[PDB]
Design a protein around this ligand. Structure first.
Ligand code: HEM
Ligand code: HEM
Ligand SMILES: [O-]
Ligand SMILES: [O-]
Lengths: 181, 181
């Protein structure tokens, strides 16, 4: 199954450390996040919100970039990867109206998204989920997990990405910081 | 709402003329196709199959190709366009494992998908829906409609695409030919 649900509430595998409402409407503070590898028909009782998205095919990365990523990217659920962050992201209508070459040029040629991210591997494991096509309020659910040794480096990565050309088209963004239970 | 369902059965806006089971498991012959905007998980008891997909963002076309398409491509629902064809399509695992540059290279540089297609506009109107990400048995639901004057031209277009490098990666394909009621 390629579908995942993220339920903010009183159950889950991850404890919410803090929520930072970076841009646009935030998400209600909750105790934990419950991650399920399937769709949940409705938000459970007592839970505050549900996000969902699917794993999909590559949209921008070229073969040589995939080879570099696969050489170093770490697995999920490393014993030491006790910290994580869920970052839902929505991009603007202007972005989605652009053609494929226009979006690729912004994503890598101008912002060097993959090349920059590659510097912060293998410390940081990641997972990308898509959800605009499901009608969700966000466009992407991005997931990162790492050991505390890499907290400072991950903050530096965030600083670089938020300053990029790509991020000029980001319209809504929230950070849910997590600690593994 | 970007989700559409196609229910093969006894009711609907379109009458089935024939079903050509081009490649792989076919679709059971039915009387009509009913098209619904949104998702359904029931389908009337007199229905043989349901298909679903969503409209999404551009994946391969570049800006100059979009400009050429927009200059000539017709709208759906032309008074004269009383014939339609629904063509569900599934591509191989090998296709989906390829990177973005590799898939684009086959799609256009080698197969000339958009350049060939442009030759049959404005006669043929089209819609493209995606459904691999929904876990469906097909990957795409493609839709075409035209006046009878263009039936032979559309048959020619099919001939040319089925012989392309791109189509070497197609592993299931069906044609549901339809007439507007
Ligand atoms: C940590 C190292 C990172 C690496 C190696 C990395 C790599 C990538 C790659 C290769 C893609 C393209 C996938 C495709 O072609 O479909 C992608 C997509 C994306 N990533 Fe990252 N990334 C990293 C960090 C981040 C961070 C920190 C964020 C958010 C703050 C982020 C947000 C996104 C988004 C929103 C997309 C979707 C872009 C789109 O389809 O428009 N990534 N990432
Ligand atoms: C009639 C003229 C046609 C034109 C102008 C045309 C044009 C296009 C374009 C520009 C795309 C890329 C959309 C994107 O960038 O995401 C596309 C995708 C596609 N077309 Fe066509 N097309 C035509 C006919 C057909 C026919 C007759 C079929 C099937 C029998 C077909 C099957 C597909 C499929 C399956 C895709 C998705 C490709 C993929 O994502 O791998 N097209 N078409
Ligand atoms: O990512
Ligand atoms: O198409």
């Amino acid at each position: 199954n390629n579908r995942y649900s993220f339920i903010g509430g009183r159950t889950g595998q991850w404890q919410v450390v803090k929520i930072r409402n970076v841009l646009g409407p935030g998400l209600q503070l909750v105790e934990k996040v419950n991650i399920l590898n399937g769709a949940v028909a409705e938000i459970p009782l007592d839970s505050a919100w549900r996000l969902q998205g699917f794993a999909s095919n590559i949209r921008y990365a070229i073969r040589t970039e995939l080879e570099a990523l696969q050489a170093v990217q770490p697995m999920l659920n490393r014993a030491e990867a006790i910290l994580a962050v869920l970052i839902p992201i929505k991009k603007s209508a202007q972005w989605w109206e652009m053609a494929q070459d226009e979006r690729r040029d912004i994503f890598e040629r101008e912002s060097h998204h993959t090349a920059v991210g590659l510097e912060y591997l293998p410390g940081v494991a990641r997972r990308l989920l898509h959800c605009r096509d499901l009608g969700e309020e966000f466009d992407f659910l991005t997931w990162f997990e790492f050991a505390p040794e890499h907290s400072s480096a991950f903050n530096e990565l965030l600083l670089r990405m938020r300053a990029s050309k790509e991020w000029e088209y980001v319209e809504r963004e929230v950070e849910v910081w997590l600690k593994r239970l």
